[PDB]
Amino acid sequence: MLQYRIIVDGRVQGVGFRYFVQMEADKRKLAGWVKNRDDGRVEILAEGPENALQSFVEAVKNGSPFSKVTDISVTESRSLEGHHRFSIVY
Template sequence: MIHYHAIVKGRVQGVGFRYFVQSEATHRGIKGWVRNTEEGHVELKVEGEEQAIHDFLQAVRKGSPFSKVTDFQTNPLTEIAHYSTFRIQGY
């Protein structure tokens, strides 16, 4: 089990990007959360099996059909949060 924090920049607000992220996470059995930031980015924290997380992060980096990802920053986290679901949060 691994845990990651990511910031996604580009055209990622107002285009259904958080729902895309939630769908990709749910499809792969990944738990965590995603939210818009006040700066216009999308932030997420996810945990799951290593291969599932790497595949998920690759899909998020590529983006959804209506988004345009221009910068994608990821950081592995050392502690596991034991999220029970994947959800969309507010700011």
């Protein structure tokens, strides 16, 4: 489909952000993962149809309770790894 690599910065850890991203990804039937980086940022790999991916990016910007998204970087690829499911990963 398309794969997005999304990096989120701001007040985005210890705020239920991974859970929020996972609920949005499952709602939008996207596959991939969300993971906290040790530098405070959140990485998101998401694969799916373009309408789902675009609307997902907008939802991510709204964040979880107490979060504040100050930046979102997105890079894209047509090469999907064929992920199923969306996981909170370590």
